Structure 1
Amino acid sequence: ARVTVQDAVEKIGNRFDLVLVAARRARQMQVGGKDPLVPEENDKTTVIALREIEEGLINNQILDVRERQEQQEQEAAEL
């Protein structure tokens, strides 16, 4: 649970790019079987996504790199 999102807003300056990146992360959590790297403690997907952003473990660049890598294994799976 996060009362405020400041740590995120200095993690992501725009605070609207923050919404987009953390929304994509939470979408990956709900739709994909992937789970948040930071442990979940009775927290919804958006809250734990903001928590992951807070630690700096997740950002827009890292998220784009991760999805590109996942598409790479998707291509490699077909061979």
Structure 2
Amino acid sequence: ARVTVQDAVEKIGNRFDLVLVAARRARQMQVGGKDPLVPEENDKTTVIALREIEEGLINNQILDVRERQEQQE
């Protein structure tokens, strides 16, 4: 699992904002159809999104830039 989310909160800087960004990413990953930016060690999309946030690979700006690129293409 993931007993604590301290590092992801440290990255994002607000706890409520972490909950929103992680939910957006997890929805992209489960229903939209996307590939994890980290190995999926038998983890649910919620935990995978959280541990992508932990490593600085995802945040609101990054999600937004990628989505605007997709809209252009």
Same-fold call, TM cutoff 0.5 = yes
Q: Mark the structure with the bigger radius of gyration.
A: 1
- 3-state SS of paired residue (1:32): helix
Aligned identity (percent) is: 100
CA offset at residue 32 of structure 1?
1.8
**Deviation sequence 1:26-58 (CA, Å, 0-9, x none):** 000011221111010110000000000000110
Structure 1 residue runs without a partner (length 5+) = 73-79
After superposition, the CA RMSD in angstroms is 0.8
Structure 2 residue runs without a partner (length 5+) = none
Measure the CA separation in 2 of the matches of 1:13 and 1:26: 19
CA offset at residue 2 of structure 1?
1.5
TM-score for both structures, normalised by structure 1: 0.86
Aligned pair count?
72
Measure the CA separation in 1 of the matches of 2:4 and 2:31: 26
Runs of 4+ in 1 over 6 A off after TM superposition: none
